[PDB]
Structure 1
């Protein structure tokens, strides 16, 4: 034990082994950090390099298809030599990712990085400790939702039974930026398929209409930089998001990832409400537990590592910080809390993954995104503000609750709306004249 100095690699800014990078400009800078379980010795040393062979391994493990990011666009300071810091049991090297021309739009590329030429005192337990990975997306042309580096971001649920998610586009700052970085199609369901003997994704006709018509009703949001997530919600049977066995969660996560791939979406929100007691004799199910919920989140992220796995902190959906030795910061990207409270991190997550406010736009609770509230949330280190169930019919109240906060968060207040959309209709109508 005393001589085992185990090394692993991670992104130095995020501390994640698998890090999604959005390129909003020409250059993106970070560090690659090698963590050590013991204090280094005098001669301790290592380098990093891009390891293209590992991408084959990674894609097989995740059932993914990521192409390799062009290596010439990736530069390590010092030909990749890690600067060892004895006092912090770590070593790091700067990495710059330059944006390139000729890449395919809306495609995720990978930069697999390996420890190389490590000194004899370092142990690397397996190929997964030996590597970290960056999953790179070029967002340079899809900047309208990008309001700056490190600003607070918006997370919006649409009740798609009633409201068209193109209404995302009704919300702009006076400088033209789109307010809502992430939107959720609330919601597809988990339900029992008696014939298959297991849970399945079940979409009501309103959810299905959006998916079938995603090119006209969802993809326009994504073209302007908004992440569109599929909401998943329990639905009054023996199945639920916090009561799947390991195998049940693996199978369900596979289906969720299939949806997100087929319809070109950006991830999922899980909300554990409305399920009934499970049939414990069914191998796909288990006792309801936050542990089962965590298992599902972990398996979902494994199936779609470049997409967002997010949770509503309600029911038994959130609270277990590790699955199979992997900490929650790797598999919960965003957590939003109930109206009137701020979310909190678990494991090695930070408040940057958490909502500082949740506003129920239909029912009224949760407060307002005022100048004062904006500053309170910034002071608290929160990453997100959440809204639920906006509707054009209630834009007066909705937008009233958004006054003042934009100038603090972004240097530009939210503008009064001039456009709205009707359910299942791509037509931009004039607000308020066409209501």
Structure 2
């Protein structure tokens, strides 16, 4: 089969932060090659219609003139690694649209008889390309650790993400979660639904002013989903129930122009096993939902809190978790761990409970330990302007290690449901 060589993913999201992006396309080999092993790759524009139909997506084709393969797309065989690869360059173009995902479907062609291609799936990989050159204010560089922040939107305006910058002006928090919409039972439909409390609903209704300004500066905004004290839950949907709920989550992220989801399996009660949308609570059911959610929004982030039964099964329908868990964050005091072919670049190395105090600090020591451990993420939960003294104290020193620039003292904060930047601390 064919995949992206750097990530080893068959579906790879590419964020352009500069004028070019370089990678390889890699064909895996089933036998040690010989002098005759050969293959080429090409862009397969016709396959995009098939892909979009299968995923209920609408991606446009990235301009083919902006994509270049080395060596006319002929793959260089590496006999020692059972693979063959070609360099591919993606150039940023003109006349592209901000905030639109484009597709580069790549196909194997002209392969030698020693290569067996099982199906059309193994014959293709896909790059999902986003131009992020202008939504650059959270982008702190190649290979740095990234931040993941939950807001308790019952109480705190997520525009407070903008209170957190390094001295070099970059935004600290790459990803923020609106915590949380709920899963609840819909009796009229006999199935689960997304249920948004009035605070969540107000944010979505007002996404233009209270959420999209974060996305304009490059922050990914995710909808949090959380159990909510009835028979439905994120780790207890049947295969069919998970397919249906995943489509609803994807519809929210499309309707409100968000960047994905966090799943937190807490507070559900026991399921009604006679209901066909439900099943025994388990990590396999949770993994099924994550997989189906990714199939429904392959260019958006599927992330989990490692608690309850939400995380741990590493394959669904033969597909490894690297393809459908983008980020896993752990409980306060723990580091997350990868499953399947994930690496610790998908995992949090610290989780900080900013409202109650546990989980430690993003100190210089801790930052270096996390880098040394290969972690990709640091997580924080429930910051608020009233506690900025404590929150920012727990961020002292780490930024110099992670980025060469410490977190700056806050000077602005936002009040709930109010777009006005107030002066910190004078305005409270």
TM-score range, shorter chain: over 0.9
Q: Deviations over 1:145-168 (max 9, x none)?
A: 000011000000000000000000
Q: How many residues align?
A: 428
| Structure 1 residue 123: Cα displacement | 1.1
1:38 aligns with 2:39: no
1:87 Cα deviation from its structure 2 partner: 1.4
CA displacement, residues 288-309 of structure 1 (integer Å, 9 cap, x when unaligned): 0000000000000000000000
Q: What per-residue deviation string (whole Å, max 9, x for no partner) do you get for residues 319-363 of structure 1?
A: 000000000000000000011111000000000000000000000
What is the CA deviation profile of residues 1-25 of structure 1, one whole-angstrom value per residue up to 9, with x for unaligned ones?
xxxxxxx100011000000000000
Name the residue aligned to 1:298.
291
Shift of 1:41: 2.5
What secondary structure, in the 3-state scheme, does the structure 2 residue paired with 1:34 have? Answer: strand
Task: Indicate the SS of the match to 1:199.
Answer: strand
How far did residue 264 of structure 1 move? 0.1
**Deviations 1:255-309, CA, capped at 9 Å, x for gaps:** 0000000000000000000000000000000000000000000000000000000
The answer to whether the 8 Å contact 2:9/2:323 transfers is yes
Q: What CA distance in whole angstroms lies between the structure 2 residues aligned with 1:247 and 1:255?
A: 13
Paired with 1:129 and 1:294, the residues of 2 have a C-alpha distance of 22
> Which stretch shows the higher mean deviation, 79-88 or 376-385?
79-88
Secondary structure at the residue paired with 1:20?
A: strand
Once the two structures are TM-superposed, the CA of residue 425 in structure 1 deviates from its matched residue by 0.5
Residue deviations 1:16-75 (CA, integer Å, cap 9, x gap): 000000000011111100001222222010011100011111100000000000011111
Q: 3-state DSSP class of the match of 1:142?
A: coil
Alpha-carbon contact 2:31-2:114 (below 8 Å) kept? no
Partner of 2:11: 18
Contact 2:30 2:115 in 1 (8 A): no
Deviations 1:67-112 (A, max 9, x none): 0000111110101010001111100011110000110110000000
> More deviation in 37-46 or 106-115?
37-46
Point out where structure 2 has 5 or more consecutive residues left out of the alignment.
none
Separation (CA, whole Å) in 2 of partners of 1:37 and 1:380: 33
Output the TM-score relative to the length of structure 2.
1.00
CA distance in 1, matches of 2:287, 2:338: 14
What's the Cα RMSD here? 0.5
CA distance in 1, matches of 2:105, 2:133: 22
Hey, what does 1:374 align to over in structure 2?
367
Residues 212-245 of structure 1 deviation map (CA, whole Å, 9 limit, x = unaligned): 0000000000000000000000000000000000
Partners of 1:206 and 1:40 lie apart in 2 by 60
SS of 1:123's equivalent in the other structure is coil
